Amino acid sequence: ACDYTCGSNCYSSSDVSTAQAAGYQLHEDGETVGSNSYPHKYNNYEGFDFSVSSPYYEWPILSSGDVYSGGSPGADRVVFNENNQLAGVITHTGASGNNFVECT
Numbered sequence: 001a002c003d004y005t006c007g008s009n010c011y012s013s014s015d016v017s018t019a020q021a022a023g024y025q026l027h028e029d030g031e032t033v034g035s036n037s038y039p040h041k042y043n044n045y046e047g048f049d050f051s052v053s054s055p056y057y058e059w060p061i062l063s064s065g066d067v068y069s070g071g072s073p074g075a076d077r078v079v080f081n082e083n084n085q086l087a088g089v090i091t092h093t094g095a096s097g098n099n100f101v102e103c104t
């Protein structure tokens, strides 16, 4: 039962909660991991209608169930704000160029 579906990936919100929590922790600390330095600001160039207030930050969500720990970010991301609220779940899967679509 998919709370969020990114392409073929099935995410529950515990799955989300867990990804989120780690990214949020590193955001707060002023540190990043990976060659892409996650977490980092998500601009919302795509213009998604998130309810949550900005600034937004993106952190990879792993199809593997595993919390991102520095390798490939994959195509999926968790977006959260400074108050640590979940903004949405987006993915490169299904989007053209280097844009993102929302996970459903």
Ligand SMILES: Nc1nc2c(ncn2[C@@H]2O[C@H](CO)[C@@H](O)[C@@H]2OP(=O)(O)O)c(=O)[nH]1
Pocket: 040, 041, 042, 043, 044, 045, 046, 098, 099, 100
């Ligand atoms: N598609 C997309 N990429 C973003 C967004 N915010 C930040 N980024 C991207 O994240 C990377 C690290 O900041 C950059 O390649 C890229 O931004 P740029 O196009 O602005 O350079 C956004 O809202 N959408």
Ligand code: NA
Pocket: 030, 031, 032
């Ligand atoms: Na730093």
Ligand code: NA
Pocket: 096, 097
């Ligand atoms: Na392409």
